[PDB]
Symmetry: D3
Subunit: 306 residues, 6 copies
């Protein structure tokens, strides 16, 4: 099975586009999905080797049933609202996800324009975020973001559907959440207190010792061992965004995994808490305003459609 | 006189910030003015030499009178609305301009964050535009944009206030206009019809010969000669922007000159027309939704 | 595992194409050089790594093969088949060895070509030498992006490498070369839209024309071929511009690789002889073929073991 | 099994650290080995993609028995001294090797600093070398260095333990030796004479033909064929080092192989010679002052401590 | 107030040299092209800035100047003087117009030479067209570093630009071109040390030989010249390798700018005719000149003011 | 207009600092070396351009100057003056010559230092050799951004280069060197906020502390000097980390250039001896000076003609 470009080289810009499919618009979308690889080539081929343009296309649970009449990926379902004592993870509408990445924003934008040109009249926009990484892989909170993502054989193992669902091998599951930060409150904490929130040193990105690492740190709560005691892993490509005039400072979260169960367990521990921790401390400075789940099929699945 | 970095190396990203100054906000504004070059260094230095971060700071006519006593720059006035027979150039409020450029959007955003943090509670934002150039210096209409800009000595002569206004030497004048395009209409033309609207070939960027160039093409209307037969020139750094979901496809125009009279003459020919040309044909596919005029002082003016 | 030559190279901005004939008695000298050409590639290119991307693909013609080797031949190896169309003609021209030398810069290409030719002096006569250069946005001298629909990854390997259908030669490939010259004055008299009707794709944005407007005699229409089982028959091209401004010579050096020459040959038949819906490829109304040769590129270990 | 970054992309800088483990030092060392991959990601993640920072950790024969219980790598023994008729390959103490590579020296230095801060009080330094390659892949003797290193599947076959030692599949063996050069004597040869020493042309890095190449040239002696005629290969990442004030000009040698017997056979041919060569002529300009052998486990083995 | 042409360019890895003669009646088409050549430079190169580094230096020969312009001539403009020495000669070959086109990539050079010759069709006849490439470590075809002792900065401007001695043509320069072909076979028969004695520098490290052991007939010794006041006389060279492996053509294109041709001419006289202590420059026993022409390269506003 | 040495350099990531004393009888050998150092700079550097960015700046001490030359002396040239403060002391150590060698790669620095030391063998005694490396984001050993407030452009020229006030030495500068050893254990024990109060800038963002909170004993406050008129007195710094992890040596090599040494000396006095508001520079509680010397770096042409 040939996968879509989930395991991409590092990129400094992205566009995330989420849409809903209007009544009667299904045949226009099917035609579009069968052409999306060919559009990615047309826009990116002339800009190699430095443009590094890729699009990952994802389909939600309700959209799947409208578009395809056969079998359904095993793990695919609507994003599941989490209502904890203090923090909530909302569910917002999303039928299609276009996760466009490149080494610059104009390549991302050219691709988006062609895609949405083909879809006009058949879809309704729900969200559009222009992302940009900091020059040292930092997010809006000032911390390095990405360090413990898996790489190589490890990332493929964690991210790509295999034997457990063989008609959908080479697919993945993506969860997306747009988070807005309370930057005034964050910058009133001392460096050392911010380090207890995250679980790693700020300037040098060293993990705090097991003896100092609080139970309600982000790193403690997103660390999960499986039945066999091996680490459970996902691949993130979080992107800063915002608008200085409106005081909007953001992290767009996106996590890929071979089954949503892994990403859903991490979210459960963040929002609902554990025996030792009420919730992830990062949520006292971060509000979720979207939540959607998408299956990203293998590339040949998309090509062989009508 | 040390100028601001009006004369910048080429940049692929930019943020344009326009704000109005709240009543009582005058002292906080003046304090940031005196620090803005120090902030520029602080953000930019550790990302050198590839970041190419600069900030150009401009001040409007009405704001100048509220900030400073003594002399006014001789050409500082509010943007003059143009009401043409078909097309119109609107004037819109603005007291300060921040023109921030770099090789990456994140550097721009960092600097804009620090400036705005210092101004909180003293200003009201009017416009914020994040621009990106396409990888071949093309604009939203598909044409190369920037080709005829002056360079070196010619650029300094065209852009920097000199001996005619000695107190303000090394300053310049900036005119901004945000345009929105009718991309549907534009893409309905043949390439050869588009060429005749701009005045140059699409793929090769060669100027159309004078026997073929229409009187109402953009290059024809914006070509202006002065008394001595010299070309009157400006320096532009137009930037694409937009949003695919709202069908917003724009060009942010910014033009620097040594006196606003040059830019204003070009604008009159475009919007009002001449004897041979009803108006700039680029306007049949471009609507202006802002318009403002600023003076960008010499750097040591700000330091003091 | 028979190691293939570098048929599947990363993107390169420079090439030398060298075609020679082997003189009476030159066989021995040629055999010794063939066994050394992988060492020479390492010697010249190592000290420019990692940016250099220096590779050499060596090719052997049908007549030469019989002169250098005894026993079994590749199943598909014959001389290039002249095509005599009602209007257009594909010529066959002499060539026993092909050196296809690529790199991120022309000096690496030239220095390898000097080592090779040094060793063969007295054994071989030059028939063609072409120094190619890519435009900065992957365009050809006709103004179009060139290479977009080439296969990549596993798809590329399947299309270009000999497998179980001829196991003794597994890991080889077949290369066809033609040098074309372009009548640029006649081309530049067409409107952009008329040019796009000849190729099959939009000029600036390299988007494929819709199946409703694509003419049957366009380039892209005639070089799209499906097999009996409905699979796409694909080749890998690395077309390079070349020329001389003084002599008004503006050219494309065509090179295509495939696992069997039947695929390339079917597409040349379509272009020069036409189908029921199309007299010939309209790209030939502005392009003249002046050379044409067919070569087998053996697996690397075949060459080493000499 | 996931190997360490033996098979690195080319790097222009490196730091070679060799230490011994003091009395009582075992626990501190085991704790650090469990964290080293995490430290390498910590230092290097924010400098990607240009940093190319990696760290290969090696453990010596005596140390292995102090640190771990149970099975031992089959090839793992202390470095074997060779006392030739003219030249000697010495053996010197070393328990742990850190091979730090990157595009720039500061990244190498930052990692070293975090590794050694954790080890302070547990270990004694034996050798610290800051290496820098010349901009055209040349060594201190002025020759391109690295040309015939295997690449790809060829390198994985030559370097990585597999089925012959299944408990330790994915590791490798490393020999290091520090050489000091006599540059004044080297530069007194003509280019042509130097070419005869090495076995390759100096400017063009083309190998001399088998008819010209002398029997005692470096390339001739370090070309070995197995039982089947097949070439025996090692991966090398030799690095220049020195100090202009003390007149120190060096090559730090480092060779990786699936079994030490390949590298040990090459050292025998160089220091003791053959029927047609007395010794490797490179050794008349090059003196070994350290020698140590180490096994570099698969990355998963370290993680699991 | 003088704006020079880009004689003092940054280092560039590609060049095209085009020398043409002006046909009878073509004077007016040439004048109109000279007035547009800066515009053409911008058209081609602007969209590849800042990495492209495209420039064109236009020069005009002595006989052509009197056909094209009326009034004053630059003081040192005369035809190249043939040098007939006892062994080696410097030929004088025809040439009305030079276009020295430089860039970081050959395609930018080609595009610009295409536009120029497109407007000159029917008015000029081509005499020479060379496509130069850099070796990665600034070497020439002889394997020595080429450019080391060129002036830079303030020294360069003083060495190259016409000033108050000829004030109507201030900002101009004088260019001398010679195409050389090398006898590579003979050169490579020398020992490295003997090659060093021909040039006067070490090969590998490019350190100048000390004044006691540097031969008097070494390249460096005969091109080192001191004035009446004892100060060095300098020129600015941008020599470029070129060649064709098939035809055994290994070359250096010599191009040297100076504020007055007397400086370049004294160098050539020393090389070809010799001194009391040197018969001729040893480099000439391995290098044959096949073209020789002299041009005046006006200030930039001189061309556009037409 | 004299030509300065390369005091105003583009940013470099590596450096070698070499400080030697001249042995009795060694004078002539040193003078010969001085007349060639620029030539050696070009020999080593030209083939690596333009990324190599190799430069060397040569300085001469007070006592060495009168041993080497007859006639005039630069007005501000004198031995480094010892500062014996109540707590901290700035030592004077011997040094006759300084080579400040910079490039993008340490190997280029080492190659140039090899040639220079090769020429001086037997006539000089080395006193200090340091190999420096800057961190990827322009930080120093203390983990702060180091260089921010250096003057650029014309202001740099005016600050650093001797002009009309000492006309025979115009285009010269003065260099003060101090090798510092840090107590990194003590440093890393401070919170980030307390380290910010030592330096007087934010650690992550490098924004200067506002004047109401900036301590009077911060490094930035003590090294901020206005002159008679109320103009800011500036120097040009190029400080370089160095060390050895095995011997626990973590250092900053200070070098500072200025047109007259009184500016550097005033800053040093405030650091070590304090003011009415501040006992000493707090950076010295974590920093110990183990070398100290002053040099004149004459104009390049002075060196040439000698
Ligand atoms: C406000 C939103 C978020 C921010 C700013 C954020 C930031 C970060 C940071 C700075 C780290 C440390 C360095 C590293 O990437 O390894 C990290 C680690 C991590 N984050 Fe997030 N995060 C966010 C949301 C989430 C969410 C919603 C999930 C899961 C559904 C998640 C999963 C993880 C995981 C798994 C790790 C790696 C921990 C480890 O194994 O060491 N994050 N996050
Ligand atoms: C409305 C959106 C605009 C777009 C998309 C646009 C685009 C262009 C393009 C594509 C060129 C040709 C290449 C070049 O020399 O840059 C050009 C030239 C020019 N534009 Fe615009 N332009 C716009 C607005 C303006 C306005 C408002 C003014 C003046 C006030 C201006 C003044 C000029 C000038 C002076 C030139 C140079 C003409 C010459 O002498 O060759 N443009 N512009
Ligand atoms: C004394 C310092 C050493 C220096 C300066 C040095 C230098 C070189 C040079 C220039 C080459 C030629 C190019 C190449 O890398 O292929 C080379 C090749 C080689 N060296 Fe060394 N070498 C040293 C020590 C060693 C040692 C100790 C060994 C082995 C124990 C060794 C094994 C090899 C191997 C196998 C090759 C490749 C030979 C081939 O197949 O052609 N070297 N060395
Ligand atoms: C076959 C043609 C040529 C080749 C391959 C060649 C090559 C070289 C080389 C390798 C150098 C030493 C490094 C450096 O560039 O400084 C050199 C220097 C020089 N060449 Fe040539 N050259 C040629 C023709 C010429 C001609 C025709 C002239 C003058 C008309 C010339 C003038 C110089 C000058 C002035 C130097 C600088 C000498 C000094 O002051 O150190 N060269 N050339
Ligand atoms: C241990 C030695 C040193 C270290 C680690 C160090 C580090 C720093 C840092 C981080 C800065 C702030 C950013 C900057 O503008 O570059 C700074 C500024 C400065 N340092 Fe140092 N420095 C050291 C010694 C010195 C010494 C010895 C002097 C003078 C004799 C000096 C003079 C300055 C000056 C003038 C500034 C700029 C102050 C301003 O105007 O903003 N420093 N240094």
């Amino acid at each position: 099975p040939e996968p879509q470009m989930v395991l991409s080289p590092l990129t400094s810009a992205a566009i995330f586009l989420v849409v809903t499919i209007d009544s009667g618009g299904e045949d226009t979308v099917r035609d579009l999905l069968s052409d999306v690889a060919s559009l990615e080539r047309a826009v990116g081929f002339r800009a190699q080797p430095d443009g590094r343009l890729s699009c990952v296309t994802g389909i939600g649970s309700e959209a799947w049933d409208r578009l395809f009449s056969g079998a359904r990926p095993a793990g695919l379902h609507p994003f599941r609202e989490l209502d904890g004592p203090v923090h909530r993870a909302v569910a917002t509408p999303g039928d299609l996800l276009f996760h466009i990445r490149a080494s610059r924003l104009d390549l991302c934008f050219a691709l988006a324009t062609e895609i949405m040109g083909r879809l006009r009249g058949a879809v309704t926009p729900q969200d559009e975020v222009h992302g940009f990484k900091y020059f040292d892989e930092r997010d809006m909170l000032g911390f390095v973001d990405g360090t413990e993502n898996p790489t190589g054989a490890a990332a493929r193992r964690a991210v790509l559907v295999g034997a457990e669902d063989p008609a959908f091998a080479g697919g993945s599951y993506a969860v997306v959440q747009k988070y807005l930060h309370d930057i005034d409150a964050w910058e009133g904490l001392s460096v050392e207190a911010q380090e207890r929130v995250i679980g790693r040193r700020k300037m040098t990105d060293v993990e705090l010792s097991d003896d100092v690492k609080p139970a309600d740190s982000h790193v403690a709560l997103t660390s999960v061992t499986g039945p066999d005691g091996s680490d459970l892993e996902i691949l993130r490509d979080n992107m800063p965004f915002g608008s200085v005039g409106r005081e909007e400072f953001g992290t767009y979260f996106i996590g890929y995994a071979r089954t949503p169960e892994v990403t859903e367990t991490m979210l459960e521990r963040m929002f609902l808490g554990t025996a030792s921790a009420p919730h992830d401390r990062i949520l006292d400075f971060s509000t979720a305003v979207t939540g959607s789940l998408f299956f990203t099929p293998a590339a040949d699945f998309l090509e062989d459609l009508s």
